[PDB]
Design a protein around this nucleic acid. Structure first.
Length: 276
DNA sequence: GCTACGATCG
DNA sequence: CGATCGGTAGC
């Protein structure tokens, strides 16, 4: 019932210092989160890149403070075609991106504004807000179709440069990845299809659970807690947000934090330092 | 008031 | 189990 995120370890196993900080956050309503003092934290965090999930907001409405964000001058956004005030992702960065694509190159899955790929120098970044299988699992059957595709797309990317996948990947991979593993085997985020698909994901590319790789033992590390009950004040949550990065990035991997004390939404931000 | 983002205790 | 009372942000 504890979990206290450890200190920020800013060095690789090789030896050299950090040279890239990536923060990702499922803000649960961009606007609201903003009023909730989110940018103060952002400005306070100083990530070189900031991926945001569930922005649930279209560009011709984006809060003004955004542009006013200093070291994040390059802002890219994505929203659902027919879904007003739904899904939506946003990638922000200090250094400008060589190439920036939206979605995973697939019609039916791209129509919800859930993916953004930012190509860089030493690596590539994708930020995603994975399709919730919904309550009663009304969408689990479809979900798996996304996954089938998603891993397919990501693999072809990990063929040129080191890939960095982050966002609400919407899955409690292992039982260690949620406070109550047993009591949720028949609730979204923990289905054996989702979990399997996720594992299948790791192997296929392949990719690595940055955090898990740093704390294989460390339990109670949740990045999401439902608003229901006093969930957060009781740390009874799930860890649905990850930093999956190609194998080649592991000798450069510094840390993977779960900034729990960061208040703003049902999810907490997650930062990835890279000694690139 | 509803709709898409699950811990409780029968 | 599995029914459900039930915190949000946004239409």
């Amino acid at each position: 019932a504890l979990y206290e995120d450890p200190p920020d370890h800013k060095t690789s196993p090789s030896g050299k210092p950090a040279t890239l900080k990536i923060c990702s956050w499922n803000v649960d309503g961009l606007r609201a989160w903003i009023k909730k003092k989110g940018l103060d934290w952002v400005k306070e965090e100083a990530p070189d890149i900031l991926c945001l999930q569930e922005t649930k907001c279209s560009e011709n409405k984006l809060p003004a403070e955004l542009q006013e964000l200093p070291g994040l001058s390059h802002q890219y956004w994505s929203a659902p075609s027919d879904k007003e005030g739904y899904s939506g992702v946003g990638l922000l960065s200090r250094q400008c991106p060589l190439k920036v694509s939206y979605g995973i190159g697939d019609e039916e899955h791209d129509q919800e504004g859930r993916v953004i790929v930012a190509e860089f120098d030493s690596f590539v970044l994708v930020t995603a807000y994975v399709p919730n299988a919904g309550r009663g699992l009304v969408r689990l059957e479809y979900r798996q179709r996304w996954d089938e595709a998603f891993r397919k797309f990501l693999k072809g990317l990990a063929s040129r440069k080191p890939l960095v996948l982050c966002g609400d990947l919407n899955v409690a991979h292992e039982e260690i990845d949620l406070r109550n593993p047993k009591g949720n085997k028949k609730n979204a985020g923990f289905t054996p299809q989702e979990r399997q698909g996720f594992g299948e994901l790791l192997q296929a590319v392949p990719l690595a659970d940055s955090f898990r790789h740093l704390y294989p033992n460390t339990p109670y590390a949740y990045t999401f807690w439902t608003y229901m009950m006093n969930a957060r004040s009781k740390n009874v949550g799930w860890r649905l947000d990850y930093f999956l990065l190609s194998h080649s990035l592991l000798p450069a991997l510094c840390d993977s934090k779960i900034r729990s004390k960061a208040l703003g939404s049902d999810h907490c931000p997650i930062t990835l330092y890279l000694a690139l």
